[PDB]
Design a protein around this ligand. Sequence first.
Ligand SMILES: [Zn+2]
Ligand SMILES: [Zn+2]
Ligand SMILES: [Zn+2]
Ligand SMILES: [Zn+2]
Lengths: 196, 195, 192, 191
Amino acid sequence: ASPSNTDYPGPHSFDVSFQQSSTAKSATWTYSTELKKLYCQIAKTCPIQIKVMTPPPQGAVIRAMPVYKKAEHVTEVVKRCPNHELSREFNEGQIAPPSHLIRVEGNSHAQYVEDPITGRQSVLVPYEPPQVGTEFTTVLYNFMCNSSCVGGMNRRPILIIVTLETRDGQVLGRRCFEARICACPGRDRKADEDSI
Amino acid sequence: SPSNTDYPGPHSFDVSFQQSSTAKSATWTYSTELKKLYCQIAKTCPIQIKVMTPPPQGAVIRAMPVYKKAEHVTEVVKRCPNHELSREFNEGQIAPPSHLIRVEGNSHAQYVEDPITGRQSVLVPYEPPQVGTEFTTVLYNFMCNSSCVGGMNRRPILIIVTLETRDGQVLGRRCFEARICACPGRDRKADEDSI
Amino acid sequence: SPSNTDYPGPHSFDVSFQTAKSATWTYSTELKKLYCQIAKTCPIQIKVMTPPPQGAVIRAMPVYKKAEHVTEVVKRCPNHELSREFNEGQIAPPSHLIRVEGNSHAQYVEDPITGRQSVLVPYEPPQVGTEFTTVLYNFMCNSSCVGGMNRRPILIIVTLETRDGQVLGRRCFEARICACPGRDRKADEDSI
Amino acid sequence: PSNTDYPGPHSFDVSFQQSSSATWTYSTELKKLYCQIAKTCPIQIKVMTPPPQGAVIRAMPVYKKAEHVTEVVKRCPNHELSREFNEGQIAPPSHLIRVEGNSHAQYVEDPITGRQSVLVPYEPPQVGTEFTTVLYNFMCNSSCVGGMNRRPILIIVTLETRDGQVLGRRCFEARICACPGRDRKADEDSI
DNA sequence: AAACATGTTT
DNA sequence: AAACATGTTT
DNA sequence: AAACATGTTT
DNA sequence: AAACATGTTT
Ligand SMILES: [Zn+2]
Ligand SMILES: [Zn+2]
Ligand SMILES: [Zn+2]
Ligand SMILES: [Zn+2]
């Protein structure tokens, strides 16, 4: 079926967020508060804090999944274009399937999974409590294909579904935002909020 | 490396085109002197073939691509990875999804990849002009923007239309530079401009 | 002091590589010198003729080229080992210079006796059909960091070691993690 | 912190003098001062009507650019450990501004805002003079990695009272660098 | 001062 | 890339 | 950053 | 056509 994209705080109050991302000449990435939109160069890393009020179960995992924003596309899956999934660059750390779009870095436990029935690709990472003294649980993500790759996304608006799931796999919470992995997240952001 | 030296041949093998006005957005256009041709993606494209003395039996017409720049002549011309999987343009599986040049409207045409050099090309049996005409138009389709990532990266490329015999020895050869792009109009007026 | 004498080893342990406006990194054939922007990634193929033992690990260790410095160790300057940037994936000690990325098995080790820092990675055979065993490396401090390396020529010692830790092979090259590996390379080979 | 020029009731005014590789130099109009690292630096203080008892002179740094005014000014991590300049431990290794040649001077970090500053009891001019020179040392190149990254910064010399309310305030932009000569001639140039 | 080494900005 | 900012060398 | 090359959208 | 989206150059 088509994955849900309806904000769900969950029982533990599952909430994501970011932080300061000044224009910094060419910040590797930046996020817009209201637009729930994030921009960010190719393979470069990208944080993402995870708040919670009441501690989660055992399995406590955090699936990150991509999927189109536009209707007529929700039906299709999100893979890395043919080129980038062969160029070999970014494909040395073969720990990640050369087809997935989203990669978590700096976590050995993370496991890449492709739904067998729907074909949908996603990445799981065991939930580790905040850093003693903090409340956020930053996670490192890498997007492997310009949201404008020929034969891949063709500038087709796409959004990421970060969801807090349990051991068995039922949802415990879900949040969501639109991403635009590009070249100059600076321009494409100022130049974007502009238009309006 | 394949030869790119103009060779009229014994039968006076000559190619050409015709009127290609700006027509708002003509699918394609050719520049007389620049021996350069521009033309949108998959869209079709003519190409007349004149001859003075009738050719042999085999009489075929190989059309082959190859870079213009030196340091690249060594490398072959294939369709980038994307377009040779996108499946679009790959229903008429009659053509290998890797070739750049396709002839359309001719069942006899056969796609051949040299085994030894890896070079890809397309052959089409030579059919005499249309009773009353002297040209032998042939329909060509270019499958990859001459600026495809991991394919041609705007690397100047030219097409080698050659009239070969049954055994395969040359009988004539002509050549021109191509620039399959998006708005052959702009890229042409905007090109001749620069100078 | 660690050895820096090329040693093909019994299994024939050999490394290798392979201007793009601003290529994140580049290597010079003869100079056995490599240039490459800060934290950006960097490959490094590893050939072998005869399969190695079980432990089969690959220690990558930095160390100065100049004599009067060989005596001192190579750490990340004070600034970069606090700036917190590059220090989220706390999997790596904020002091090491060399990091391998895309390998969970890799373990960072600081010699207790000599203080020397290094990174180990279990040797995984080539990709069925290939012969090289690419490894991803990240250099965390401009070879010109104040109070860190002060442009002091430094070289990397990639060595193929066994389970117990005795050497099986060793190769070596000079590195210059900088800003514009392009310039600093063309502009370098120039001088001569 | 406020950066609006305030002559005050006693007519609190600062100034410099002749600065023709001078360890430092100041530009009249630009209200900008340049000056090598740890090297010393004067700063005359004029007044028309004598100040109260407390009479102190807080010297405080702070960015010029908007998006930074929010952040504090500390010595980068390196220089506040290098130990050099940190023998006369009389000064916290983190402060940027140091007054030298005055034992009474006390270094204070605001507890609530985190802002660092240095106080020095106001001593009347030298019998026959009207200025009250004060010696300042800037401990971090206004271009230190992880410290100021060439981020324009300015100093707020203010004449405060015993309780701490302001009595006057003046201000100028500083650029502690390497060759205050070049960076000055080469600066006024650009325009 | 003038030139040169190098990260950053345009 | 090209120009420029800035602290060392020379 | 600013300009430029080029496919896509309006 | 004209304006605009987007990744390279400069
Ligand atoms: Zn891609
Ligand atoms: Zn293509
Ligand atoms: Zn450093
Ligand atoms: Zn400093």
